[PDB]
Amino acid sequence: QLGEEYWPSVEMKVRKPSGQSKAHYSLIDYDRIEKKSRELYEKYRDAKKKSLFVTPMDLWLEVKGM
Amino acid sequence: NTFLTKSVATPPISVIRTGPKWWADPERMVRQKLMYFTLGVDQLPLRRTAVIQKDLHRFHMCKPPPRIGDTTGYKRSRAAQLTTWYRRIQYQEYHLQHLFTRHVWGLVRAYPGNTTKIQGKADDGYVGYDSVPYHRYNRTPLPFPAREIYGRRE
Amino acid sequence: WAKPKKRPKVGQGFHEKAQKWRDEFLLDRHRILADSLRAYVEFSASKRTEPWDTRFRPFDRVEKDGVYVLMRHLMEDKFQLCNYHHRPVKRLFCNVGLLGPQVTTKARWKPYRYATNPANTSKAERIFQKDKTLYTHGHND
Amino acid sequence: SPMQVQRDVGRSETPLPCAGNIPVDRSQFPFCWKTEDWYEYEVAKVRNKRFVFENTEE
Amino acid sequence: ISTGVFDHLPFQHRRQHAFNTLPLHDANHFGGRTAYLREIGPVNIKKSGRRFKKDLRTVQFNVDIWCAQQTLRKRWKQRDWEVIEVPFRLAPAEQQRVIPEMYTDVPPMTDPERHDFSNIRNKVYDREELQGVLFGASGPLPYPPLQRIDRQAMTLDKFL
Amino acid sequence: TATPERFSILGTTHPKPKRTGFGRNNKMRSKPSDNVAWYDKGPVEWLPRPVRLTYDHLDQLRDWMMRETLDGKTEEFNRIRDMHREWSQHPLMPVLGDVEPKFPLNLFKQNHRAKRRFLVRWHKANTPANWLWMPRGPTVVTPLHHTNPSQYPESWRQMVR
Amino acid sequence: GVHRVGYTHPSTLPVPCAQRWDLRLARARIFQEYIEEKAPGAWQLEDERS
Amino acid sequence: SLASLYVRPPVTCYTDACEAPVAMWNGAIPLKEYVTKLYSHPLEASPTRLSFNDINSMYCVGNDELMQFFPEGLGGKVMQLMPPGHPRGFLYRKEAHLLNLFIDKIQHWQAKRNVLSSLTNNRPGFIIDGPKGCGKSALMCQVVHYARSRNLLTLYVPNAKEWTHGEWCWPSTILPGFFDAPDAARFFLRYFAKANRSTLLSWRLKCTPNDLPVEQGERQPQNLYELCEWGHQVVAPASIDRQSVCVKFLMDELSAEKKLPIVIVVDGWNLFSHDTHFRYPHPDFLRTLASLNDDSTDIDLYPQELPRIPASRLGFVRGLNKMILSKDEPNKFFFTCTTRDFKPFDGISGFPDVETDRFTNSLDEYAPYDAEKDSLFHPIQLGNFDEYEFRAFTRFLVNSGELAGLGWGPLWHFSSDFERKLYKIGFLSNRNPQGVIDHYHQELVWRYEYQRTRQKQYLLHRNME
Amino acid sequence: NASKFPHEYHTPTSRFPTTPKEKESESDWMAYTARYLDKQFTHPTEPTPIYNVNKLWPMQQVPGKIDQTPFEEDQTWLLNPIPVQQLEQHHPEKDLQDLPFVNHEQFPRSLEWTAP
RNA sequence: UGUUAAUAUCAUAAUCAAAAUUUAUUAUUUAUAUUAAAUAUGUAUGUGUAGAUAAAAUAAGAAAUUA
Ligand SMILES: Nc1nc2c(ncn2[C@@H]2O[C@H](COP(=O)(O)OP(=O)(O)OP(=O)(O)O)[C@@H](O)[C@H]2O)c(=O)[nH]1
Ligand SMILES: [Mg+2]
16 A cells, blocks of 8 residues: 555466467578578588588587687 | 396296286286287287186186086096196297297397397397396306397487 | 393403404504595596496487487587596486487486496406495495 | 166156256366366365354354 | 376385386386385395385385476476566456465456356466567567467368 | 504404305305296297386387388288297197196195296296197198288289289 | 576566565565575475375 | 188289188178178278268278378378288378368469468468377378379478487587487488479479589489488488588478479477477587586586477478468468377376386477467367267278288177177277277277177077077 | 585585586577577577566575576486485474374374364 | 282392394395485395295185095
8 A cells, every 4th residue: 555566466377489489480580590501501511521520510519629 | 128137937827827917917918919910910819818818807706616526527627628728828828929029129129128038139038237247047258238139220 | 031141241351352453443444444435536536438328229329320429529528527427427418408308218327336337348247346345335446 | 868768667757857958068067177276176175274264244 | 197106115025027026126116216225136134235225114205205306397397388477557357356375265267257267377378468568668579479360261171 | 544564353353254155045056047048949938038018119119110111121021920820820729638737735835935846847848849739830721821921912913813 | 497586676667566575575574484595496396195 | 601602802902902811800791692791991092083972981092002102101100000911091081071172272272372372361281280189190191192192292291209309409500500300300301302202303403502512423413302312312420411401402492492382291380389308508518628626517517407499499490480481482381280299297297107108109298289379370170080980980990900800800709799899999989089099909808798798698598499 | 615525515504406506698598599509699588578587486586596497307306416315204393293103192182173 | 922919038230312233933125327414234246046944815816636
């Protein structure tokens, strides 16, 4: 009885993002991802003469050496 | 297949005598019938034994039929031959089931329990990760890790 | 109920023979504890061999492909660091995240005692002949 | 309906059961329900054993 | 309803490995958890063997905690919702009444007068419908509005 | 510390002689048992170890079956069917007077172990190599199964006239 | 998941509302409830048998 | 009883081939008068002849037509009624007929564009909805056979459990920020190519790299089939990068081609509309630790739950939502499904008994689903069998398992007649399709049947008089 | 050097599961790909309601404390460092009665007693 | 079957913690994951393996030679 700042909140079982909105999660940044696809593909076509297997570690996966 | 430690050797007579507890385990008769209906084989033996044990379970809570006081005694070895035909039926069926599983395991490329012979891959029994560094039946030292049985493509 | 017989007298000087006996017993424990901690911590810091079993999927796949290529291309440094011990191995597997729950449900791991032999053993007599004087609860080589 | 079929042999089962016209509510019977319903119901029943205001104004 | 084995088995004589008999603490009981109560070999009773892997009540308590772990696994797996503390003003109307707490009143009905006695303790709301509430004033809706399925629409489901 | 290089009385104590034999009373020797399995007699060792098929294996088998069935392959199928036609023919009615011999009474105590020991040691020797009570061999006719792997329907381009 | 227990004031939201940890604090004040803080979030086990 | 004077009819189809030994199915299928059997193996009918008057009846597929039209295999449990001797028999359900007519409009979709839009409600294809216990994946297999008998390029995903729940997952090589499905897609290329070799030999590349890294002497891919052949006919672990390349550029091809009708049939899009059993690998797996004592690292010490990968994070689903969500492709038709192959959960759960678990190969998912809120597809409701389809399907089971001998055979005087075996099956299933398929099997242990002992008493009571 | 050795030093308050030390931004999959995979991703994290997410539900937990939620995969409990109850089994009220078999009672009151 | 109600005429032996096995009259946990709360058993891998021995017809499912 002093104001809404004390009205106790409700607990809503807010569902996680459904599939209709999970489907856009593959096309998010599709333009930049496909561009870096077209470039990484050229580095990969290069690399296939260097090693037996071309992992994404040498493409877009990155780690600090030490 | 998880259970790969050692197992206990029981004869068919006592494996069958467990009656409707495990021998006529209905959910095990079923799950071995599923191996047959997968492989595409007629289930003549398991169905014969299922018929026999359905009879025996239906007529377990009941009393035997009365004997007559015959010095000549024929009922005795006649019911004896009856029982021991039922028993032989079930011995054949025991062997059929065991064979089909130890062959299907070589087909699924799954490893059988310890010293469970699978003539689909190895003429002797599967020995590996055993409580003894000697062969349980050949007294041959085991390799580390467990011996390998099937191909490596899965 | 027969009247329980009194325990006879302990004897002469035995109170002090037990003194010296226990004395050199804890004396011997000194070295036993020393050597046992030596053996246990070398057991701890030693890079162990495989905890899994190669008799089940996904660890029955070839040593070139599938979860094995993931093992070489994400965790190959971590396992050699943490000494292949089955506990940290399975936890790095739980945190690799790209196998799901399988690091229990589908993966088959060696028993606790087949798991704790050092890297690259080829006998079955190793676990059954490990030293029995190092009171490591079997936590020694 | 089974309550209507005269299973009797000699005497005529007339009158028939007055239930011979009950509806069918999958929402009433058969008893189907979900498990959190079952649990919350029973544990709430259990915990509210004491919360009795024995002095109402009935 | 669960065809799992909840109870640890009575500590009795040694169950062998034959038909109908496993090790009392083999690798298959509780998904391999009997490793934490198993000891190996024909234990010397006097000198070896852990005194708490011989009793029945403590081993059964361990097993009970493990069963509870399992119930918790499956229960928290069963969530596609999260509890978002919406103020009173914005929550959709079914959450605007006096909802007694858990285990306080009968698990309350959503609304009787509107033909839905659905568990409001078990009513789940989607972000793409509560969008006007939470992040209404955050620019472009991070999710799209929901595409509906029309059941009056004359499609292959209506035999045309 | 400075662990003494001579031990006075503790190390001198009587040596508790290690347990000689194994098993009950640590006296059960190291010699063959009733439990030994045989790899020379039958595709199923006798006495067999208990196996247990699971639904995991039923599904793995069903999937293997889809693959070997859609790869045109029928050879392991006809192998299955032949190893089935080997052991699944009806065994003859036993001759009247032929019965599994129970262990004869009035030698051992009722609760003894030798009673079941003889039963297991005879049920071992009665191998599939000793199953003379069922029809097996080139002397058996099978009026219920198919005679040649050509009558199987996967080779159904053979019976056409 | 490894989630940081966050709690935003009743002032940051563009609708104020009494937040549940503050209500927890008011209750552990009224009925002198000890708030054990090492209480991990992954251990909300209930006694099924009970 | 007319066993010697019964002759075998000739061989023309696989169902003509799977006739059991007359002694086995002798009393099962009564031979009546030239004396011939009462029950018969159903005719291998083509869908182009299958029409309104095959409904609620059983047709089939021969081993040949099946090996022709299902090289990746079938869906979830679809080889359960197909042991070698069994003729693989499909029912012509009243919704499977609607799907066949939809495909009958497909191979001329261009003339029927507005036709199918009226038929799709602008929703991209149909998702088959219904509980666990229906004919979903088998329905999709019927649809696949339909289309491939119409010469349509059919991307048939046999299980979404394989795509979101493999034995492993990986970063997609040429798809930064994303992932691809290495082994499930390894099989996908191999079996989509070895399936549609017909269309993909004449197929020509539109938006693809003609500078593909090809092993020496191996021929550069110029067809769409050559792409996949180079894609899976390779040594590992090069196959994983080749396969992500193949998924991305094959999807670019399939989303670029505008003319040839394309069928895409996905079993269990509810396992595509959400997160995969893979999660993201630890950041401390992305930094090459230096030492253990003092690094502030708790991955070797304790596990934790890194957030879960939505299926939209794989490249195959990437192109698949790229086909669904991206319009202007009214050539592609998405007949996806809803699988309910998870383990159960009913308030409690102990530790499921290893040997006794019919859901071990179920996915530890438990999670809900909603056909409407979780799909762009239109729901086609395949509810449970009526006793109608139950009865037809079951007559097929209970009598062709005889005519191939797979069932009771010369022991037929022990399990009841059809009108009581079916009463028992339909009770124990509640007309449920799966309950029926498995209580036609659990029939072995039906330990409370008296039809045969009451009939034996009638015979050993009357055959006196 | 207390934290260098995780299992030696357990306060009579210390409790399990012992939470791990946190990395930078392990929060969700959007922030995960933003910092860890695709450093140039468009979205900072999953767009968050400005309100309160009681993820840890219904357990009210101390804010500012990095906590886990009750796990999902049945593996992590097998593969945690959680012990089993080895010594005696106490409850602060039941411990008056000292065992089940010797269950004590002050007065012979009914077990279904409805206290006023 | 130890502690119990009428025989007298050697001596204080009685748990409040931390304890010393010779006492027939006892069902131990068996190889994916092994020490966190009054502390809580470190020994015995071995062909289920001498001799003699244990229990049971009771919600489990047993079948035939009376004094
Ligand atoms: N031969 C044949 N079998 C069918 C048919 N319909 C159903 N079945 C059989 O019964 C199985 C179960 O039906 P489905 O709906 O396809 O199986 P499913 O539930 O999708 O499989 P999971 O996702 O693994 O649970 C079928 O997969 C087949 O084995 C059919 O039309 N022909
Ligand atoms: Mg399916």
